[PDB]
Amino acid sequence: PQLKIYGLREFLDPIKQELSDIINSCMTDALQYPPEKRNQRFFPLERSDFFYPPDRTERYTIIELSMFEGRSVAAKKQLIRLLFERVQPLGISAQDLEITIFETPKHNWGFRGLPGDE
Amino acid sequence: PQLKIYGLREFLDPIKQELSDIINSCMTDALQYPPEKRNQRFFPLERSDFFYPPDRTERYTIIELSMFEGRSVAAKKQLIRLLFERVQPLGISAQDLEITIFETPKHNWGFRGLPGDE
Amino acid sequence: PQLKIYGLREFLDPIKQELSDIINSCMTDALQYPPEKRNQRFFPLERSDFFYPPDRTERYTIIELSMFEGRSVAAKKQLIRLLFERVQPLGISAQDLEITIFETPKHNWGFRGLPGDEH
Structure with missing residues (x-):
């Protein structure tokens, strides 16, 4: 599973390391992936590139997650x-976090030299 | 509804503020979202990082939209x-604009503390 | 077909022109797009922004493909x-390359002034 994290540079860079491990702990606890399978890409944005809703603050953060289909709604x-x-x-309250999960079939993935369904 | 806008930094940077309001007005018009929910991330690109078809110009721009499933094809x-x-x-003619819309279930989203279906 | 390519800047920058033609050759060979329909975006990443698995090297590269529904699993x-x-x-080994393909219907696309299902 691949994660992409977006946020303003000035507030995402100080917490980048701890956020990485915390997100990874959620991947292990809710979806049972081994901790060493951590796959995260961070995109610290300048203020002029980040048009977030005015109901939110400068700590507004977005996580996008791509993974196999087949996991339940409960998980x-x-x-x-x-x-x-x-x-x-x-410092990331519920108003300042947004998550989107995308699911694709395993035969649409490739890793370690074989299709995902293989 | 999240949007991501990609273009050459040389030509996207001078116009991204107006383009942002222009894009926001299309969301409000075609999809009845309030202007207050503007959610956009801009990605100004280097020329060596952006391989687009040769029949297009340097003003080539890509818009990626991610939203809930359930809107009609007409909308x-x-x-x-x-x-x-x-x-x-x-300055973005029809040859220089490409749009992609991705849709996912509401229970695949996390925003304001809760899975989207709640 | 839109392609996004990610990796550490140290190793992606010197090879990305060659990587661009190689990727575009695989799209033409396997899915028969014309080579002039190349559509790629590269994102060279810094060390503090790329958290890849430790069973992988600094050459780890991610390729995302977004295209129309309708191509077979075999293709x-x-x-x-x-x-x-x-x-x-x-110099990118099998362990160091990860690929993800996303599919969407044609009416979800806009290009050349019209929705994808109208060309």
């Missing part, structure tokens, strides 16, 4: 709830 | 035509 | 196998 909902709860101490 | 097509019509004053 | 699988085989000369 995907558990992951969303873990992400909201565990980013709180980083 | 999505009205959005595509409004984007083509309205970015044209900014 | 998509051949595209995956070709990408793995052809990125070898540029």
Whole structure:
């Protein structure tokens, strides 16, 4: 599973390392992936590139997650709830977090030299 | 509804503020979203990082839209035509604009503390 | 077909012109787009922004493909196998390449002034 994290540079860079491990812990606890399978890409944005809603603050953060289809709604909902709860101490409140999950068949993936369904 | 706009930095940077309001008005018009929910991320690109078809110009621009499933094809097509019509004053002709819309279930989203279906 | 390519800037920048033609050759070989329909975006990343698995090297490269629905699994699988085989000369091993393909209907696309299902 691949993660992409977006946020203003000035507020995402100080917390980049701890946020990485916390997101990885949610991947392990809600979806049972081994901790060493961490796949994250961060995109710190300048203020002129980030047009977020005015109801939110400069700490507004977006996580996009691509993974196999076939997991239940309950597990995907558990992951969303873990992400909201565990980013709180980083200064990212529920209003300042947004998550989107995309699911594709395993035969659309390739890793370690074979299609995903193989 | 998240949008991501890609273009050459040389030509996207001078116009991204107007283009942002133009794009926001198409969301409001074709999809009835309030202007307050503007959610956009701009990605100005280097020339060596952007390989686009040779029959297009340096003003080539890509818009990626991610939203809930459930809107009609007619509403999505009205959005595509409004984007083509309205970015044209900014120097983006129809050859230089490409739009892709991705849709996912509501329970795949996390925003404001809860899975989207709640 | 839109392609996004990610990797550390140290190793993506010197090879990306060669990587661009190699990827475009795999799209033409496996899915028969004309080579003039190349559509790629590269994102060279810094060290503090790329958290890849530790069983992988600094050469780890990610390729995302977004295209129309309708191509067969066999065609998509051949595209995956070709990408793995052809990125070898540029020093990217099988463990260091990951591919993801997203499909959407044609009416979800806009290009050349019209929705994709009207051309």
